[PDB]
Amino acid sequence: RFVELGWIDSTSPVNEQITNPALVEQIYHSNNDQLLWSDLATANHFEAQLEVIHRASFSPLFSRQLFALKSYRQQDRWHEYDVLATDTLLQYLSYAEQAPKVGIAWFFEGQLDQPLAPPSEEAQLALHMAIGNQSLARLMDEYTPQDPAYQQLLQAYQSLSSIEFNEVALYEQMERLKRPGDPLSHREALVQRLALVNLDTTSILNDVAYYDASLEKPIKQFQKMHGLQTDGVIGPQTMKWLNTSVTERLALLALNAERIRLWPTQQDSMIVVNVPGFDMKYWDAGREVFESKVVVGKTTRPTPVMNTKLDSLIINPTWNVPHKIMVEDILPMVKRDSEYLANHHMEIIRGWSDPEVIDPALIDWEAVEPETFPYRLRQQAGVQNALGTYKFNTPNSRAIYLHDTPSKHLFNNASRAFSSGCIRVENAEKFAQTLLANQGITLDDFPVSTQAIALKKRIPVHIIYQTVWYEEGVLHYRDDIYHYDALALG
Ligand SMILES: *C(=O)[C@@H]([C@@H]1N=C(C(=O)O)[C@@H](S[C@@H]2CN[C@@H](C(=O)N(C)C)C2)[C@@H]1C)[C@@H](C)O
């Protein structure tokens, strides 16, 4: 009924499957009712690009279209294929344009289940042109992030895609742990599985019945690759990653490539925190000037994906204990431990406006119900302050900022989801120094007390969620700390 095309019949399912009949009609008329997709290499390139979106499991919309396309192809229904491909490429183009704007909706909040708006005029133009110059492939590639980050993940996806269904024995072992020097049953499976992730297995010795030196370094860099303690020990966490299928790895790659559409371009001066990587990097004038491990929010108080700017830096910050924390977390502990306040250098304050220190002794602690308790808590400046020596002020509606910690031992863990959402920074001192250097700010000597310092040039802070990324020659994988890789894996 609905698609007014001469060479498509009325009862074809394409009439219901198509999103923008109007715009498809126009394109086909402008090209004298000719097929855009009769070149195989071109259809295959576009089916490949939709497999990616399929595996990433974030768009039932594109999955529907791909199944339908793949179904028209198996039956040699090349007229129906042609028109549905054209409609689906319009969607791909809306998708390419909209993700950086509003893609947070599809990858974190909800999903791309409903047809997108048509693409911009600029895009419809580029398409018309591509149709005439027989360069649809170039058009699709042009509408992928021109980011080496993207292309490195796609390169790896393409390699692994080539060997998806090569069966490879599951790596097994007798005991839950297995240390250098122990007997080793399944050496073949283990080495095959180190190879899957393109670790160099060439120097590993053959048919040695034990976990020898030749295996230590490959195992330790497989561990590093997966952000695990490089202890050399084949335990459950190692085996989880060793024994992941190529299907599972391609899904991780797919999701993480598509996620790079969200991440806001790249700036010369910029700060990136990768949550599941529990790390962060400060670029300034094209240069990586600083990197550091961080602690991010716990699963229950997660660090959200967001973009803000670093406005100012506080040296020797006092910590104004927010209400929610005082009421639930702190007052009930001072109600029992009558030494809490003094140990944590935490003084009682009339109000944030009226900063009068009240001695804890002037208070009927039996009498206090935390919910209604009328004064406020303020931790004095110091090394043992919850914010340590440095607060990094990133003002935003969610009250998330970067700060030093006194609990520097927590950086020793592989998995660093301990905070109430804020981001604790190892080597805050160096971070402070490089910021001030690159702002053209000097300090005649280190301040006695609390010092606010506004940045001349505010830096964008991007907090991303990236479970796969390319860095110094190699592809890193990380556990799905906050469960957003959920659908990709099954
Ligand atoms: C940021 O997360 C909040 C602020 N920053 C820190 C932090 O990095 O965790 C917390 S302090 C810590 C978590 N809850 C407190 C607690 O459990 N007790 C028993 C005192 C200590 C702090 C809440 C916030 C400003 O957004």
428 contact partners, CB below 8 Å, separation of at least 6: 388, 389, 390, 392, 403, 404, 405
- SS3 state of residue 23: helix
Give me ligand 1 centre to Cα 423, in Å: 10
Atom from ligand 1 closest to the CA of residue 321 = 23
Token pair of 464 as six digits: 């991303």
Cα separation of 277 and 481, whole Å? 9
Atom from ligand 1 closest to the CA of residue 405 = 8
Angle of CA points 107, 111, 116, to nearest 5°: 110
The answer to whether 31 touches 89, Cβ cutoff 8 Å, is no
- Judged on CB neighbours under 10 Å (0-12, 13-18, 19+), 346 is buried
* Encoded amino acid at 143, one letter: Y
> Helices 60-74 and 78-102: crossing angle, nearest 10°?
160
- SS3 state of residue 377: strand
Cα separation of 271 and 76, whole Å? 51
Cα separation of 96 and 53, whole Å? 12
DSSP tag of 302: P
Give me ligand 1 centre to Cα 407, in Å: 12
The answer to whether 315 touches 389, Cβ cutoff 8 Å, is yes
- Judged on CB neighbours under 10 Å (0-12, 13-18, 19+), 69 is buried
Q: Say if strands 376-379 and 417-419 run parallel, antiparallel, or are unpaired.
A: unpaired
Give the domain range for residue 213: 182-247
The count of other CB atoms within 10 Å of the CB of residue 183 is 11
DSSP tag of 106: I
The answer to whether 311 touches 401, Cβ cutoff 8 Å, is no
Does ligand 1 lie within 6 Å of residue 394's CB atom? no
Phi, psi of 254 (to 5 degrees): -60, -60
Cα separation of 102 and 117, whole Å? 13
* Encoded amino acid at 199, one letter: L
Q: What technique solved it? A: X-ray
Cα separation of 20 and 124, whole Å? 13
C-alpha radius of gyration, the chain, whole number: 28
Q: Whose CA is nearest to atom 16 of ligand 1?
A: 329
Give the bridge partners for 282, in sequence order: 271, 290
Token pair of 144 as six digits: 């992928």
The answer to whether 41 touches 247, Cβ cutoff 8 Å, is no
Cα separation of 13 and 309, whole Å? 50
DSSP tag of 423: E
The count of other CB atoms within 10 Å of the CB of residue 409 is 8
Helix, strand and coil percent figures for the chain, each rounded to 5 = 40, 15, 45
Experimental structure resolution, Å: 2.5
Give me ligand 1 centre to Cα 104, in Å: 26
Q: Say if strands 287-297 and 417-419 run parallel, antiparallel, or are unpaired.
A: parallel
Give me ligand 1 centre to Cα 126, in Å: 51
CA distances from 130 to 32, 124, 231, 252 (A): 15, 10, 53, 31
